[PDB]
Design a protein around this ligand. Structure first.
Ligand SMILES: O=C(NC1CCCCC1)[C@@H]1CCCNC1
Lengths: 237, 300
């Protein structure tokens, strides 16, 4: 069934699993037309498919050409997501295929189940966690590859950089979700926190800065403060 | 006009004959039902006064044999049996009729209710759903489960309805996942009608039989089947016009006959709201939508 705070360590056991987030698949800008009506212009999107134990991210870039001449794009986006996730699974060796796929939005359950009928032993699950994966496009290197794509493309990343050399996957996921929640609540400030000190750089093969263990504690505290603040600045508290 | 005699009525029981119900007292001088219209299937059904648990009954067609009821004190139920001695049967029935010991099947000159509820129901198809080949009639009760229910436990006592499952490889063509899930026309027309049922008459016969088992026995798996067969049509964008028109008549008469007090348990809110207000066929079931809105506006 659903994934919540009670079964949270299940994410870090040795059963292969993937989170699928579809919130950045169909992206638009809304604008006025010369006649003063409103229209949308699609921009490139992405499926965010993440193994929370290993940090492996399968970022399938959704090029705007996939929407050309199609209707009901928000509905189609869920089905396109499920088609691409199914294609990914079929492309993996059997021993790498997930035992469970956890979707971040319940509207992805039926599309994914139907596309995965051939895999009756892969469990398709919702979650009650409110995960901040929509903020993935606030990570500069991910946004850059999505916006530069001229055709459909899959790009593989490790979203934990090298953190698993020093910390467990539980701790790495908690750090990731903290960073993404901050970026979601106040992107400019979060990005300031992360890049204030120019002597700490992002390696060419990494997504986040090369913080020492002590610097990560400071960073992590700065992100919690930001989230609490905005939560005050929001509700006035 | 045919007859189903009873040997006796040793236990107090409510006997239903199609949509009619009447009470028989313990050891009352009751010897059966006469004037049964030829040309239709019929159902004779029972609820004991002492145990309203397990409604049960028998589907039969008097053209297929001479049938009677006899109570079995060991198995504790009224059993249908076939009499092969035609002369014995005729003699028994004539005696009971002369003595006026039988209730008369109603003959209201205007009423087409039973025809309309059974138009497509054939005894030969009932006997494939309810498998007991040594008898010409078919036993059904409240507790019998369906083949589909048994997949999700005794196979011989099951209802072998045609399995419908919208999230199944049978329903979904590889490469048409979104198309086939959101518009079930290929599953309705190619898989089910052309493939399994052969024609819409057999499909409607099974739908009508499932409804009648749901209504008369409270059979839950039959109710599931009835709703699934409705939803499969309503969720198809491409349905032959004659089938839609006939479905509207079928469902109108089913909703008309349903006891008002059983609507809570025999009608699935989700299916009916989807079918009348959201589906491809939301505007194709005028008679059914009108009777539903006037008889059960709460469900909607
Ligand atoms: O219910 C009715 N008759 C019963 C049939 C079974 C034997 C007992 C009587 C009729 C139906 C409508 C006309 N008046 C009553």
């Amino acid at each position: 069934g659903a994934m919540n705070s009670s079964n949270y360590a299940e994410l870090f056991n040795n059963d292969i699993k993937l989170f699928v987030d579809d919130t950045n698949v169909y992206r638009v800008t809304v604008h006025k037309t010369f006649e003063g009506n409103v229209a949308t212009k699609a921009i490139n999107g992405c499926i965010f498919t993440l193994n929370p134990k290993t940090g492996h991210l399968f970022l399938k870039i959704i090029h705007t050409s996939v929407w050309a001449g199609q209707k009901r794009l928000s509905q189609l986006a869920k089905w396109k997501t499920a088609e691409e996730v199914s294609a990914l699974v079929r492309s993996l060796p059997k021993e790498e295929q997930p035992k469970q796929i956890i979707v971040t939005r319940k509207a992805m359950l039926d599309p994914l189940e139907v596309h995965m009928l051939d895999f009756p032993n892969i469990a398709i699950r919702p979650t009650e966690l409110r995960l901040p994966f929509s903020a993935a496009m606030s990570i500069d290197k991910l946004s850059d590859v999505v916006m530069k794509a001229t055709e459909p493309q899959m790009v593989l990343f490790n979203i934990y950089d090298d953190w698993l050399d020093r910390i467990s996957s539980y701790t790495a996921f908690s750090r990731l979700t903290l960073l993404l929640r901050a970026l979601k609540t106040n992107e400019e400030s979060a990005k300031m926190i992360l890049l204030s000190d120019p002597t700490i750089t992002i390696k060419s093969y990494h997504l986040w800065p090369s913080f020492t263990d002590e610097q990560w504690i400071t960073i992590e505290s700065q992100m919690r403060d930001l989230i609490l603040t905005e939560y005050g600045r929001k509700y006035n508290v | 006009m045919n007859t189903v005699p009873f040997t006796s009525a040793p236990i107090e029981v409510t006997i239903g004959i199609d949509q009619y119900s009447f009470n028989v007292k313990e050891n009352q001088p009751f010897h059966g039902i006469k004037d049964i219209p030829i040309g239709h299937v019929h159902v004779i059904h029972f609820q004991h006064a002492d145990n309203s648990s397990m409604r049960y009954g028998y589907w039969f067609d008097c053209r297929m044999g001479n049938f009677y009821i006899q109570y079995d004190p060991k198995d504790g139920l009224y059993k249908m049996m076939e009499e092969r001695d035609g002369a014995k049967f005729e003699n028994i029935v004539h005696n009971f009729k002369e003595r006026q010991m039988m209730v008369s099947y109603p003959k209201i000159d205007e009423d087409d209710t039973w025809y309309n509820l059974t138009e497509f129901v054939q005894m030969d198809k009932i006997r494939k759903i309810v498998r007991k080949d040594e008898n010409q009639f078919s036993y059904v009760d409240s507790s019998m489960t369906t083949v589909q229910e048994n997949e999700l436990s005794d196979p011989a006592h099951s209802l072998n309805y045609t399995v419908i499952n919208f999230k199944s490889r049978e329903a979904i063509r590889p490469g048409h996942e979104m198309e086939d899930f959101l518009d079930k026309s290929y599953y309705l027309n190619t898989v089910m009608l052309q493939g399994i049922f052969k024609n819409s008459s057999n499909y409607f016969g099974e739908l009508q039989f499932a409804f009648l088992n749901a209504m008369f026995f409270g059979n839950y798996g039959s109710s599931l089947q009835w709703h699934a067969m409705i939803e499969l049509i309503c969720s198809s964008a491409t349905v032959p016009k004659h089938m839609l028109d006939k479905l509207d008549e079928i469902l109108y008469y089913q909703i008309k006959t349903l006891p008002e007090q059983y609507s809570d348990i025999l009608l699935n809110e989700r299916v009916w709201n989807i079918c009348l207000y959201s589906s491809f066929q939301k505007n194709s079931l005028h008679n059914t939508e009108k009777i539903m809105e006037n008889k059960y506006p709460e469900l909607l």
